Structure formats: structure tokens, C-alpha cells
Amino acid sequence: TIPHLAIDPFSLDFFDDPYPDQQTLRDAGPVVYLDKWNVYGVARYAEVHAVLNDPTTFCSSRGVGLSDFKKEKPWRPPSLILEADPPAHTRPRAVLSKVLSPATMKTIRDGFAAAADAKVDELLQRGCIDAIADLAEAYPLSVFPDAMGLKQEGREHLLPYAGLVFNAFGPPNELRQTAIERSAPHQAYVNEQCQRPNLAPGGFGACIHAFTDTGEITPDEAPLLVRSLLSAGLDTTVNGIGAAVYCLARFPGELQRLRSDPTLARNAFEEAVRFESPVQTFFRTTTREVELGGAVIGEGEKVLMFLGSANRDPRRWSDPDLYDITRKTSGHVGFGSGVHMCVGQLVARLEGEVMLSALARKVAAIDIDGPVKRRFNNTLRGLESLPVKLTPA
Ligand code: HEM
Ligand SMILES: CCSc1ccc(C(=O)O)cc1
Ligand SMILES: [Cl-]
């Protein structure tokens, strides 16, 4: 009943151009079996959305990577939020929700926007830049570690730790095993910065620790929740802003629309999250036998969701393969959906908005003027290098 496919969604060929293989996955049926890794796959919007929105049947506490925590030892202590189910999930979720709240956004917005304008002005002096190292990486690196309250020393470890995290959701291929081999110093740095004494007053980290007396979390939970923000909050935004710039460079008509109405900046970023989905895939584990898209999946089975594919499903989206900054994007699953829907989305959107705003006001053209290089990762999609020429408005 369920079709069996030999496509490896964690192969370099697949990362290099996933879209044909994703259509193959979608069109094979609502539920496929991937023989390469012995997991179920869902690549259509309807099923991805369904799975995300049934956390009881499709749980996160057995890991959202290939590895099933009931069978194997997690490579690091489980995340208290990503890798928990309700009810254990609920109160740590509420804390991060309050730390990364509207009111917090209001306190950091002017500083994030100043840094974005400053960076763009700086890049315009150089003219010819690498939009990944010099922009997509540089800008979040200039605001997010400070917003966390991290010391200056050791920040070089943040992006490698994050790449390690996203590679570790994948299967035990060479990307994963190589990241884990080199992980020790990145883990040591991160875990040490998660302790209260190391997090500057006023920051997200110190705020998490200050929530440890409300009865929502205990002091011994706070360092792992800081760990969550250091895992999830930098590299994703780097790839999201990277996606946006790449899109504006490939769709000059849309840069021109953005320039003419900079208030389109927030939706232009959202549409880039749909179009390139920085977080491409991750898993759930079935807690019982279940019927999904007319197919029967047994208990204790891993289910691979293709978020990027869901976001390009022509069953859901008109002209899914176009970047349209005035698209009604609501419903996209680039930030997930349901109880685990990205708790950091206000931070991401704020970074993305104020950067695209800066570009909209200061830049007349973005032309690729060098070889584009992709960065390969088991679950993150994004570029290694994007040489562009920026023309000042
Ligand atoms: C464009 C940028 C981002 C993207 C595409 C993204 C994507 C996602 C997705 C797809 C999920 C759902 C995972 C699941 O359902 O298992 C998620 C959850 C989460 N994200 Fe984000 N994220 C981004 C930015 C951020 C930022 C900036 C932070 C922190 C400041 C953050 C922290 C988290 C955390 C802690 C979770 C776990 C939430 C939960 O399990 O309730 N993310 N993210
Ligand atoms: C899979 C969505 S991105 C993400 C990575 C790490 C964590 C965490 O460490 O809790 C949360 C979300
Ligand atoms: Cl760790």
C-alpha cells in the first residue's frame, strides 16, 4: 500500500537540488517508506501539517532526529522543550515564550535595527561582499550573542555547535559522525555559558534564569533552556537572512517592489522562510498505531516530515516555486506548527525584517558576481558563500 522509495534525503545529491526528489516524494503518495533509513516520510503540506498538529500520536520525546531515544542514547541530554511532550513541555515553553515575548522585542528592536542599517552601510562601502560571511552571518553575530548576554570570548564556537546540532538530527552518515567527532570543545563552551554567572544582566539567558522561582521551571532546568536558544537561535537566522538575500538577488523584480515599499520587509522575509525553509526536515515518533493519509503506521516508528516540500506543495500553494513578497504566507510550516511552533519566531522575524528594511532603503541592486557555494547539513539548508555586488540607492 505504502510506496517504498530509495531516495536518500540526507545525501549530498539531494541537498544539492532537492526539489525534483521532493516532487517525486509528494506524488508517490501521502505517506512513503524510505528504505535507505527505514522511516516513514510525509512530503505534502496536508500530512506535514497533520503530523505537526498531533503531538500525542506523533511525539517529540523520543527525539526529533532519526535516533529513537528509546533505543539509543541521545548524543547530548534531551532538550527540555524541543524533545519533550505535553505536559512536561508546557511550562518550559511558557517561560521561553515570556523571555522571547513582544515586550522583549520592544526592548531590543531599535538596537537590532541600528545594527542592520550600520552593517548595510558598511557593506556598501566595500561594494563587493560575501552575502553569507559578511551579512547573513555577520549581522546575527553582531546582535544575537549580545542579546543572549554572552561574553565576547569563545563566540567562534557558536556556529560550529549549531551545525553540529542540526547535523545530529540526521542519520548516522558521515556528516553526522564527523560533526560529533569534533564536538567536544564546542559542547564545553556552550554548556559553560549556560550557567547563570556567565550570562549578562538584561539578556535572554539571564532572563531564563530569573524565571526559575515562579514554579514554572527550577534552577536546574535553566541551563538547558539557555542551551536551546544557543542551539536554535543563531544558525537558523543566518540561513533565513541568507535565503532572503539570495532570493532578492535571483528575483530582481521583487527587490524592486521591496525598494518601492519597505513596509513589505517583514513579509518578504517570511516568504523567504517559506521559499528556502532553513530547517528542511525533522522527525516525530509514533506512540501508537495510526492511520495517516489512508496509510497505517505502527507504534514506535520514525516519521520524517519534509517542511521545505510542504512549503512548495502545489496542492497548497499557487506558484509555489516563485518568490512573491506579497504572498499570503500564513500557514507555511517554515517555523513548524502547533505546540512546538518556533518559540523564537519573533526574534527571527525581527532580525529578518530590519535587515530587509535596511536593504530596501539603501540598496538599488544585488548582483551575483562570483560562484555560489552551498553548505551541506543534514537538516539545515543554506549557502556557504554568496558573492554579490551591492549597488547603493
Ligand atoms: C528563520 C529562523 C528560524 C527558523 C526557520 C526556525 C525553525 C523552527 C522550527 C521549524 C521549529 C519546530 C521544531 C519542531 O516542531 O520540532 C522551531 C522550534 C524552536 N525554535 Fe526556531 N527557528 C528559527 C529561529 C529561532 C530563534 C531565533 C530562536 C531563539 C531565539 C529559536 C528557538 C527555537 C526553539 C527553542 C524551538 C523549540 C520550541 C518548542 O519545542 O516548543 N528559533 N524552530
Ligand atoms: C528543530 C527546530 S530547530 C531547534 C534546535 C534545537 C532546539 C533545542 O536545543 O531545544 C530547538 C529547536
Ligand atoms: Cl551540548
DSSP string, 117-166: HHHHHHHHHH-EEETIIIIIIHHHHHHHHHHHT--STTGGGHHHHHHHHH
Each domain of the chain, given as residue ranges in start order, spans: 1-393
State if residue 247 touches ligand 1 by the CB under 6 angstroms criterion. Answer: no
- CA 111 – ligand 2 centroid, Å: 25
State if residue 79 touches ligand 2 by the CB under 6 angstroms criterion. Answer: yes
Closest ligand by atom to 60 CA: 1
Question: Is the separation of the CB atoms in 190 and 157 below 8 Å?
Answer: yes
Cell 525584517 maps to which residue?
353
Q: Which residues pair with 332 in a beta bridge?
A: none
- CA 389 – ligand 1 centroid, Å: 31
Residue with the nearest Cα to atom 17 of ligand 1?
342
Nearest residue to 164 (alpha-carbon basis) of 379, 391, 384, 390: 379
State if residue 208 touches ligand 1 by the CB under 6 angstroms criterion. Answer: no
Q: How far apart are CA 267 and CA 245, in angstroms?
A: 14
Question: Is the separation of the CB atoms in 57 and 75 below 8 Å?
Answer: no
How many CB atoms lie under 10 A from the CB of residue 66? 22
Query: Integer distance in angstroms from the first to the last C-alpha of the chain?
Result: 57
Question: Is the separation of the CB atoms in 47 and 328 below 8 Å?
Answer: no
* Domain 1-393 annotated CATH 1.10.630.10: yes
- Identify the sign of the CA torsion 302, 178, 76, 216: negative
Q: How far apart are CA 148 and CA 233, in angstroms?
A: 10
How many CB atoms lie under 10 A from the CB of residue 120? 22
Sheet holding 128-130, edge to edge: 128-130, 387-392, 363-368
Please state the length of the chain.
Answer: 393
Question: Is the separation of the CB atoms in 158 and 234 below 8 Å?
Answer: yes
- From residue 18, alpha-carbon distances to 10, 12, 226 in Å are 10, 10, 33
Q: Which amino acid is at 109?
A: R
Q: Which residues pair with 303 in a beta bridge?
A: 40, 284
What is the stated resolution of the deposited model, in angstroms?
Answer: 1.8
Torsion angles phi and psi, residue 146, rounded to 5: -70, -40
- CA 227 – ligand 1 centroid, Å: 13
